[PDB]
Swiss-Prot record, chain A:
InterPro entries the UniProt entry points to: NTF2-like_dom_sf, SnoaL-like
Gene Ontology BP term (one): antibiotic biosynthetic process
Listed pathway(s): Antibiotic biosynthesis
Domain of life: Eukaryota
Record gene name: sdnG
Keyword tags: Antibiotic biosynthesis
Organism taxonomic ancestry: Eukaryota, Fungi, Dikarya, Ascomycota, Pezizomycotina
Function comment: Part of the gene cluster that mediates the biosynthesis of sordarin and hypoxysordarin, glycoside antibiotics with a unique tetracyclic diterpene aglycone structure. First, the geranylgeranyl diphosphate synthase sdnC constructs GGDP from farnesyl diphosphate and isopentenyl diphosphate. The diterpene cyclase sdnA then catalyzes the cyclization of GGDP to afford cycloaraneosene. Cycloaraneosene is then hydroxylated four times by the putative cytochrome P450 monooxygenases sdnB, sdnE, sdnF and sdnH to give a hydroxylated cycloaraneosene derivative such as cycloaraneosene-8,9,13,19-tetraol.
Name of this protein: Sordarin/hypoxysordarin biosynthesis cluster protein G
Length: 142, 131
């Protein structure tokens, strides 16, 4: 059970380690099957609907690779985790180009099994339009 | 001064009412002179630099009209305000076309005067390309 900001931050890091793998068979390890997700105008109910929202993104961005870091997390008396950090993304065909923006995640956990029941992620997606398909092994950025 | 989350939420609403006026002569009513602001890739230190960055960012959006609403606010033991809500924008030339996105603001206050000394606003700006 998460009781300190550091434990909450470590759990957020574990969550994004799963999400950033795109191994959908592992998402239920950390996300409730009744997950309520919001990321901007993207809004889903249920883990399968969440996964189908992400798969569609990996098609807008072939070879998408992502990572997250954290620097400031609070765990509140209401049980909410607020975790501020950064979101990094590239396309595998040109890994020397990385887009990084600040982000914050708001999380609520299931009281029984500790999985994420509500996840609201806020960041600016406009800079990610700078990601672009390239030929792997062929220079694509000045 | 602020002691409850409902009071924190009312203050954030008042702050956005000032910001959404674009009347920079009033920004110091609620923002500290040494404001540290981040909004995605926008990042400023000092109230003068915040004003100048908003002024510059909006110069290519003549007729911009914005408003904000609040949904869910917490006030933590250490005084952080986390306020989730929505940001609405339209242009005076076409006021019926409104773009609304979720947002959250993270705020820390100056203990001496209760003004905002740190303000970090998170939201997706991509939908605003439609304006
Ligand atoms: C750039 C953007 C399209 C994204 C890449 C990845 C990482 C991302 C940020 C999200 C954070 C958590 C999860 C919903 C991620 C999915 C993405 C497609 C994500 C998103 O949906 O926001
Ligand atoms: C449309 C968008 C680019 C914007 C115009 C104005 C209004 C805005 C919208 O919420 C913000 C609300 C608070 C203040 C930082 C505003 C600055 C903008 C540049 C803002 C932003 O930085 O998001």
């Amino acid at each position: 059970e998460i009781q300190t900001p550091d434990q909450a931050e470590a759990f957020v890091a574990k969550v994004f380690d799963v999400l950033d793998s795109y191994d959908y068979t592992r998402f239920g390890e950390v996300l409730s099957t009744d997950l309520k997700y919001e990321g901007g105008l993207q809004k889903t109910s249920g883990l399968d609907n969440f996964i189908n929202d992400i798969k569609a993104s990996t098609q807008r961005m072939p070879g998408l690779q992502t990572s997250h870091s954290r620097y400031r997390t609070e765990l509140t008396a209401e049980g909410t985790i607020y975790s501020e950090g950064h979101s990094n993304a590239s396309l595998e065909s040109n890994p020397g180009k990385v887009v990084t923006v600040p982000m914050i995640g708001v999380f609520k956990l299931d009281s029984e099994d500790g999985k994420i029941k509500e996840m609201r992620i806020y960041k600016d997606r406009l800079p990610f339009l700078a990601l672009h398909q390239a030929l792997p092994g062929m220079k694509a950025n000045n």
